[PDB]
Design a protein around this ligand. Sequence first.
Ligand code: XD5
Lengths: 224, 11
Amino acid sequence: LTPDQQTLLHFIMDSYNKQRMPQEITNKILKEEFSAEENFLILTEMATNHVQVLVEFTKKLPGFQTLDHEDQIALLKGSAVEAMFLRSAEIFNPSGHSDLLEERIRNSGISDEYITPMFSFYKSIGELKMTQEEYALLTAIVILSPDRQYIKDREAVEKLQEPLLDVLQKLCKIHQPENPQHFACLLGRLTELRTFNHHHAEMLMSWRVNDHKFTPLLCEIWDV
Amino acid sequence: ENLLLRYLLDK
Ligand SMILES: Nc1ccc(C(=O)O[C@H]2C[C@H]3CC[C@@H]2C3)cc1
């Protein structure tokens, strides 16, 4: 529980807790007409919101400013899908309200082939009851992944990811000494989270056949 | 580039 490691963890939590879900989205989830079209508009707003907060959180990550400019974009794009589903898993696990959200998701023009593993995945996440701190570090670990396509200097990214692993690995030992494999179980969930890169490309195919409109931010972050 | 994203990173 180093000084420098405690300084880092406060920096990450300062940035993670600025990220909030506007009331206007929440209110739409609860008040708006319930149709496939309207459920899909709501999901589009949520996703647009997720990406804005992702960008905010990312730009404040220690060392992020000092990375090559193109590499910065590569990590944002490269991470968006995994980061969104991880935020989405936290958020889901609001009072119910979550039920109503779940039904909007199940009725928004998405085949169960993609709906199924999403909810399955949320349950996997829920079974570890992770802390705020763990969600935040996992999130930064995903964003700062040196394996994404197009990165020119993977070593630079690797430097920034390592200290966050160390912190995370320590927290796991402190808040889960009874299970010494907790860390490994968390890295386990990143494996499951990577599979959504493929799922989301597929579902984005389905949706564009139907000719659904995306926002500029969604179009740009996902190369639509 | 990806200009909307660069704008958002530079605020
Ligand atoms: N035009 C779009 C609207 C919604 C999404 C989306 O991914 O929604 C996210 C919210 C959670 C449910 C699906 C994902 C996770 C993508 C494109």
